[PDB]
Point group: C3
Chain length 114, copies 3
Amino acid sequence: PMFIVNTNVPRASVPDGFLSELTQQLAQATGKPPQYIAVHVVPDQLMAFGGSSEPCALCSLHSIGKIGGAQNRSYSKLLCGLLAERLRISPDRVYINYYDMNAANVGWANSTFA
Amino acid sequence: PMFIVNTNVPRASVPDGFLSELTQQLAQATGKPPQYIAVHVVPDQLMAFGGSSEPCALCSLHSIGKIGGAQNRSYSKLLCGLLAERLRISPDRVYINYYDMNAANVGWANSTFA
Amino acid sequence: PMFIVNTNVPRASVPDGFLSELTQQLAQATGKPPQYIAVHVVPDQLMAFGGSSEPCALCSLHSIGKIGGAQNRSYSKLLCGLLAERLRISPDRVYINYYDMNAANVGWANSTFA
C-alpha cells in the first residue's frame, strides 16, 4: 500500500517521525507488513479547499486489495485522525482518494505483483 | 471535485487569485457548491511534453459523478482556456486525466461519501 | 502516455537528459509517438518505503491502451532499470502504478481523445 498526502501545511509543522507513524498505522489498518507500505508527504503546497486556504489535504491511498466500503470508512477515520492530531488539519478539509489496484497494474522489483 | 495542475511554469507566473478563479469556474462547470471544490497548483516542476521543456501541464480532475464524454470535452475546453490565458500554456501541451470516483472510494470528514 | 516519478533522491542527482531518456525509452516500449509522451520528475521528496528513508520512488504510468499484464512486466523492468542506473534507486524500493485510461477520460488541446 501507498499513501500520499499533499498539504498547504508547512514543512516545519510536519512532526519528526510522522512518516513512521503513518507507516505503522497503515500496516495495522491494511493488515499488510510495514515493509510493503510506502508513504509520501508533500508540504508547503499552493492549495485551496472550499475556496479558502486554511490547512487542508488532498491524499491518496492505493492498495492491491483491502479497499472497500467498510475498510475505507475505517481508513478515513484513522487518517483524518492522524492529520488532525499531527498536522492540525480539520477532517472536513481532507479528501482521500482510494484505489484498489489490480496486481498486474503495480510494478515493483523489475516486474509486477501479478 | 478536486483539480490538480502540475506545471513547469514558474511560481511568479501564476496570477494572484488563480486558485479562486479555478474554484469558481469548476463550481460552475460541475454544478457543485464551491465548498466542495478543492484546487492544487504545483509550479516550477521538472517536466517534459513530447520531450520538450517548453511550458506544459499535467492535470487531474477527480469527481464523484459529473464525469463523462460530453462533460469532459467541456471541462477540457474550459481548463485549457484558463491555463492558456492565465499561465500561457498551449492547449496542445496540456493533459487532463478525468476520474469518476465512487462515493465509497473518497474519504472526507472521518468517513467516506457513501 | 504520462510517466511521473516522485523520489527522495536530490535534484542534483538527476542526470542531465534524464527526462529525454525516459521519453525515448517509453516511446519505444509503448509504441506511442514520442510527441505524445509526457514525463515529470519530482526530486527531494519527503518519503518512506518500508519505513526507511533510503532512496526510493513512487511512480505512475498512464496510457490510452498499451497497458496489460505482459506489457506492464516489460515496463517495470525498463523503468526500474533506468531508476537504478540513473538515480541509484534499488528496484525493490520502487512502486509503479499503471493506469489504462479511457480515451473519453483524457483531455488535451481543448477536447478529449474520444
